Amino acid sequence: FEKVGSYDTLNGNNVTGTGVGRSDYVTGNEYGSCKNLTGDEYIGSQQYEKFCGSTPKPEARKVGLSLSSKSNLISGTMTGRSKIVTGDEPGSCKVLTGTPYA
Amino acid sequence: GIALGMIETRGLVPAIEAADAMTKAAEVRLIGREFVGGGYVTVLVRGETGAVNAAVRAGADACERVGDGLVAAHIIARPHREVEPAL
Amino acid sequence: GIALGMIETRGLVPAIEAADAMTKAAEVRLIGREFVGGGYVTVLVRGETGAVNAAVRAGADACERVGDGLVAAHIIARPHREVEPAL
């Protein structure tokens, strides 16, 4: 048995829990459960590599890791220049002496 | 808001286009333009921290290639109450 | 104020930012925002000839980087008086 079960998140985190994943055992829920294009997927990765062979790429990494002007690691959302968020490009390469914000 | 955005330049074309950037970027009111002297002219604007930041970004991007260009810019966020008489 | 300016975008928000460019560029009265259908969105403004000319020039300059981007931008100087009831 070993009620403690190690399951690897889609990004690569080890969580020891009980999980909900697939197995050759109890049936009625296999039905080809592999398709994965959903935000906040709590479905374990182990299901995907063991039973599907297709590993999606993770989400829910809301933490945005930035480097403060003094070269140290800040994070928590982030309010700089996103590559895909447009209409904020101008000024990206300018100096803002004072209370740091980017 | 009370955050202090503010721009320095040489000439009034850059000064007023920086003011236009102020008033087109974010919800920021200018507390005043000033003729510093020797050609130096500055603009002082009040608004929210993110608001004044967007404003100063716009002013810097639209200012450096106008006339002589931007000379200085700075982003005071909490101006102490003792500084208000100076503005 | 009679000169009518008008533009499409392959998407709603490019049209919205186009209208933003209109109003931040020159004095314009955005009279209409219309859904063409399937994604095309039109915005139409009113103003002076040179005013709308410069406004739409700025809008087209600032539009191509927004989503799919600009699709059509040309303007008229003397609108026909019977069209606006249909607009």
Partner: peptide
């Protein structure tokens, strides 16, 4: 001078001058 958008870049009129104006 950044994207045209807000500020026109180097729109000459007769001879040389940028005359970007507003």
């Amino acid at each position: 001078i950044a994207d045209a958008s807000w500020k026109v870049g180097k729109s000459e009129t007769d001879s040389g001058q940028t005359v970007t104006g507003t």
